[PDB]
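step 4 of 6: structure.
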Amino acid sequence: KYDILASEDVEGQEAATLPSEGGVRITPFNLQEEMEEGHFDADGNYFLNRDAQIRDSWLDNIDWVKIRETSMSAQALLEGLLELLLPRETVAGALRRLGARSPQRLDRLSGLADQMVARGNLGVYQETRERLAMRLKGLG
Amino acid sequence: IRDVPVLYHITGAISFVNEIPWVIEPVYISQWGSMWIMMRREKRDRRHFKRMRFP
Amino acid sequence: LRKKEAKQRWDDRHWSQKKLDEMTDRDWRIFREDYSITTKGGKIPNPIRSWKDSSLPPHILEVIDKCGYKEPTPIQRQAIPIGLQNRDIIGVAETGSGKTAAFLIPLLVWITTLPKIDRIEESDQGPYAIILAPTRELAQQIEEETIKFGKPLGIRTVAVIGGISREDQGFRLRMGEIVIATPGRLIDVLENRYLVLSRCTYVVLDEADRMIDMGFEPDVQKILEHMPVSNQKPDTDEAEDPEKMLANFESGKHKYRQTVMFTATMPPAVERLARSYLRRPAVVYIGAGKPHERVEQKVFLMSESEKRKKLLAILEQGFDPPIIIFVNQKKGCDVLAKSLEKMGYNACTLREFALSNLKAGAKDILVATDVIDIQDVSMVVNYDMAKNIEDYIHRIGRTGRAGKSGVAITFLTKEDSAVFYELKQAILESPVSSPPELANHPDAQHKPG
């Protein structure tokens, strides 16, 4: 293949660092980027390295450079939710029985359930008071 | 207002409307006929009609 | 079926053939939306449909009639009921829409409606209203308008702004009811004790965005510090109550002070100024030397022989009289007028008699060449394209300096290729105008010659 001309051959390729000025982009004075994109030839042609990749029509044409524009303790949370929890009733139905609208008790219980899920267990809404009280006893 | 059944994720990650819009075809066509009548009777009353501004 | 049709017709009438007591809420909405006015706030009073239909005092109505204002501007028609309730008003509109009159009318009504005993003041307590302007020219124009309006009503107006001699300004201030001035001059006068706002009950802020852009925001804040805080309306729901506001306005000299702000933009500085000076104000949004930039322009390209058919089709669609038809030659204008008269149209040829007939409504179409004074027209028809851009701009300016934008229709032929570039530049420079036929035309790409 034709020997790709070196960026020193042209010379005067000042290593400019400014990316853009006045909105318009600043082209690099060095042909390293253009050579990487597609190599020159021995006589100043532009055999372009075939871009074999996924199509992304937004990226290939960026609108002509577009416009250039605390958690409580686990034991504490369990104890509080148990205090908010009516006898022989899960957390979910506890949301139900207080959802026929004390409001403050309702959103307190819902929030407790929510960060309890955030802890890493998603079976919160499917546990009766007996199971979670047994869990509290096990951890206590 | 339309109150629709909702089936969501317990983290709020995604929320679907768990419904299919069934209609009685004669009633739907008659309701849209009345709609046609009304939106035509109004436009002829407001000669300068201000369209909503998008977005 | 005819009685049913007549009843149906009678229920949903246009407000042009209805009476005021039957004017329903929906009819009122159609009215305000027609006049391109939008009101923010609660209990907005119904806009003034006409001077005769308005509830203005007979003396104010006679003064307005003598002033030549046949119909109030949309800004005035929408702000007068709000101003008559002593409520703060935020005006969204540019200069030339009659905002000065809309602000002065409530002050003139309140000032002229005060009792003789209540209006008697042995000592000079300064003007009862303060009008703020950002520019000397704007202040002078406002002063001229106020002199024209309040002069028959016995209201003294004093202008204190830059560009005037100090001795003349000082002598005028000693004489002692309306003050219009710039922020810097007003601040300098207040700091020197040359004028006081003890009896001030109205603050007018015109071009608040312009004043903010001029850097007078600290000056405006300092000026507002000299006003009496005891006259400020309470910052509660009562400040926008229609009955309570009307009662306070009817209180005369004991009524709470009102503030009116007119501007074209609402930047953060403008918002802070409104929050400081105003209390529960209502927002009213409406909508000079470059008519092409503010006049709707329409262009139709075709042959010369098709101009008559297009003009007939456009006229058949209906228009708001009076209208202006532009011709290149007097004989062509006469021929067009004769043709329009043959089509059952009242066409005038073009002195004062024709203008009077057009104003009265007898004449609906005015045909004249490029060669006086006429009222604003809803539409201007350019049957023959002007030979120069200045002539077309002047013809397009007949739609009015402000107010309704209007419609400018010009018929373009192959003989008008010399002005295609200028016409395209004028059209592209008009935000109120939408033309690929002329913009992409080969003859409009380069300047002639």
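step 5 of 6: annotate
 - The radius of gyration of chain A is 33 Å.
 - Chains A and C do not touch (no CB pair under 8 Å).
step 6 of 6: archive
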